[model samples]
Target: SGFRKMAFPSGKVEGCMVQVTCGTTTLNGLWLDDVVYCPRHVICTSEDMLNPNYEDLLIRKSNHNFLVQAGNVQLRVIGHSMQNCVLKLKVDTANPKTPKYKFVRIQPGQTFSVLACYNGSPSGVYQCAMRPNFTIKGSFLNGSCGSVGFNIDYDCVSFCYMHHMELPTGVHAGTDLEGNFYGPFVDRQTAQAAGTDTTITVNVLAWLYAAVINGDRWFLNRFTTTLNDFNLVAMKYNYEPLTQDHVDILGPLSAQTGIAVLDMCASLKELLQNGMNGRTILGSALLEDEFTPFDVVRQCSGVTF
Candidate 1:
């Protein structure tokens, strides 16, 4: 119904022209000047045109499905993709000294497993990840397939928090359980030779006061405020006023002297002997004028009163 009529010389019309027309508009165009017309029967006889759907048979197919399982220090991968794919495995250790990695290829419908270790440090931490990249129809492309982490502990090591306190020996004399005195000592025999002299005990208390006041903010606050508050209570009980210092002086003086005392307190014998002297040392730092009890309260229930 949309065809147009054209007149041409009764001969080879290889160089003829053609035009297209609509209801109100016409388009002038070039004809196939060097072309030959082929009938349907002629086209059917040509090899190229015989099977129009031949290219469809050679279509490239791809499948991108896979699965992963985590085991003891290992990662397992199952490749369900129709084509082969490359996968990357990564391992990290808690010790910064060493790390590990692996790369492998998996064929369609095949399983692969990789070993992940803590690199000989059983007490260290480690983790693993499996990753793959693909453009498959049903496969996971990019990112981690699976991940697992471990924290291994050995029988020979001990782990404790910072606030743990160890006691000492010689309750009255401030000696460690092994007869080691507070402060510097050559050996157990030397500390024992010092006998009942409470010099080390006194010195150890002084050291602890200095250490806590200097390094520990919580201890400093509690020490100064508690001592002052206690003295205020004593004064209320008709006792003599104890002691006092500028708030600034208390903090600085504690830092200067607290470490040695705390070191001594670290040992059982020294802690017992030094602990008694610590009372007087702490009392001396109390503020005399302050009558109000400092309402300091211990936040951690595990801390000793």
Candidate 2:
């Protein structure tokens, strides 16, 4: 229940982002069905240039997430690019004559960078630079020496919502008690409930923290494994700094690094199911003093040591 619900059409989330944060901890990422994505954490694949179906490397922003805008995405090529078979990228294939920087051996060695500002210009112009954080796997086959393929890194930022869902309602818009009509934000102010009243709703973060500490193996185990799934195969180490040799040499340990931070937030789905019951100041320190309970329990609730 928020602004511009029509933009999404039918559950295809357009121009929408799911970057939620409670404190220093955050839930900033794209949640594709059950997959936990962190931009480069997953990836947007491109067919090999040598492949018969190869047209050109294209990383459309719409495929990855909703809020991200394309036409201005960078590509990081890691591996080898030899003469006669170098990889060339141009938003506008028509202007292949001028603007030398738009094409060529931009990176001397392992990596080459280029940007496609497709949205900014009419012809969709682009140039080369050395900015990594791309999500396209890149490499090329010189066909002369051998068929050597490089890795391309392209950035795809956006989350896909597959199910019928509502925009999560709790971002403290601070309506000044005037505009309580807009998107949901707790109209919580000073302690108004009397001595004999319920004081807490449900704190998802506090619940996560509490569950983590109190023998709640289910939360953390599922957390580590969900993220570990992606890390199991394609890891960040598979890219630059560490060559293919480093990956094999380091063995499975290298893939362990692929498990990004957002894995922690995977617990959100669990919260959605079990229900979001808030806790007061007596529960966990992570939660703000939105509403403190009338009393505190020994070690279970309240900000205990």
Candidate 3:
């Protein structure tokens, strides 16, 4: 014989009288395994303790059935004193990060939230598994009862950028290089990302060059030699607004290049602040001398490359 449709009746569901069922199965029927409840007004009424008759079963009533709220709704599992019941709750919000659902156990006498039908999405379904304790199991065979039905919705968002990085790793172009020096022509763009601009200003260049030179001993020596050989006499007479003493020393090179020597002076001041040990040789003041380069040229002039 084909399986007959069962009409499991619902005892008092807290706040409302609801009979729940699937296609051919009655949620409260003996054959049905489990039923779902939402945290909304969907509440379960305690089974009648004194009697075991259909008319004697308790029916639940809602406290505020006229007005329903979203967050307050609850789901509940109402089962007879059977072995034990296992109810699994699952939520699918489509967007992986949004749907955050969890299963909560409501021990005997404990109250929990149940989904309310008046909440929103009417497309969600709840299911369960119930086992009986103390045989005479057939008592639920002919006609048994339980509580079921819940509230559901699709209110959530997605989490995508959690693992993204704002900047790439290590030494790319257009980014300020180590020591505040702009990278080669290409990396300047990267440096700008961190709020820096490139320029031919003498002070900026001096610092950049100083960094490059200090970073590589071989490069420093080579650059110092090139600047030394630029010109000796011309630097001495350069029109840099330098003091007479400065003119006597760095004037020749400054005169030959005509590049303002003030920035170099500033650069030297910066170097001194950075712990240039030869501070005494440069002089007691904070600024660099316009002819500072000449001192080195003079001292090294006799030494062959």
Candidate 4:
């Protein structure tokens, strides 16, 4: 007769969440040992950025565009949580020594429409050329949209997963009918002179993200185990009272990660923190202590007798 709501991060999910109070408001958020993320806040870890496995982190930015972060980059790109996301190159033939380029993001469904560029050696092909060493990272569908122009369509299958195979041009790649792969070769003379009509058949390669256990799975499991044990050990043995740091950390954190926790407990902590035992928090109180309907399945590869 004193509670109500659904709570808990749910089983099978690779993330953990808990509830907390701040001033007077309540919220849920996903917890990381060091940082918490509110919804829409995505992370590209510093570790991932430095790893040679992903020599480049093409961080997505505004206008649905990408900013390539290549080589030993430092700051972890946080998705507007506190983050970055191309390839468009315009070549200047008259000044072959120097070229002009710009980039934009393209996903699976986008049409050629227009990715304007290079006039040719003769230079009129809009391209996102791959750096030689970067070829193994084949990530586009170059379509020679003949008469329409030359274009490439690319989509990053995974933002963090990098062990994906090379571009496949080695047929580790393939060719033919990449939606009529051919070009915007300014004129017939240029297209033929470049021999694009002959042997420049660059095949399209497709890639998929491999499975991940580190990101959410491993951490979520830890959260589950800790929560499970917290529930058990508190009853079986003595317990440590929720500390101020725990509440403080969980406060802004709740909104940061958009994760919820067990309600009554948060209510209890809120009251105790305010003043009298189960009374008030730094300031206000948790009323209507809506105990949640949400729950997690207790899964254990562990044994207790």
TM-scores of the candidates are: 0.13, 0.16, 0.15, 0.13
Q: Across residues 1-305, which tens digit of lDDT does each residue of candidate 3 receive?
A: 11111221222122231233322222221111132322111122223222223222212322222122213433232332211121121211111122323222211111111211222222112221110110010111111223222112222211100000012222111111011111122211132232231111222222222222223112112112123322232244331222334334444444433333443444433443354454332222222221123222322322222
Least accurate 10 contiguous residues by lDDT in model 4: 202-211
Which run of 10 residues does model 1 get worst, by summed lDDT? 157-166
* Per-residue lDDT of model 4, residues 178-224, tens digit only: 21112221111111212111110010000000001011211112122
Best by lDDT: 3
User: All candidates' lDDT scores?
Assistant: 0.21, 0.22, 0.23, 0.20
* Model 2 lowest lDDT segment of ten: 1-10
Estimate the lDDT of model 4: 0.20
What clash count goes with each model?
22, 26, 57, 37
Instruction: Name the lDDT value of residue 188 in candidate 4.
Output: 15
For residues 1-305, what per-residue lDDT tens digits would candidate 2 score against the true structure? 11110111112221111331211222222222222122121121222212322122223222223222122432222221111212121121122122111111221111212111112121111111111221112221111111111112222322111110011221111111111111221222322221211111212222334343333334333453243443332233231231333223322221223322334334433433343355322233332212111111112433222
Candidate 1: Cα lDDT at 213: 35
lDDT of 1 at 19: 23
Candidate numbers sorted by TM-score from highest down? 2, 3, 1, 4
Stretches > 4 Å off in candidate 3: 1-242, 255-259, 276-295, 299-305
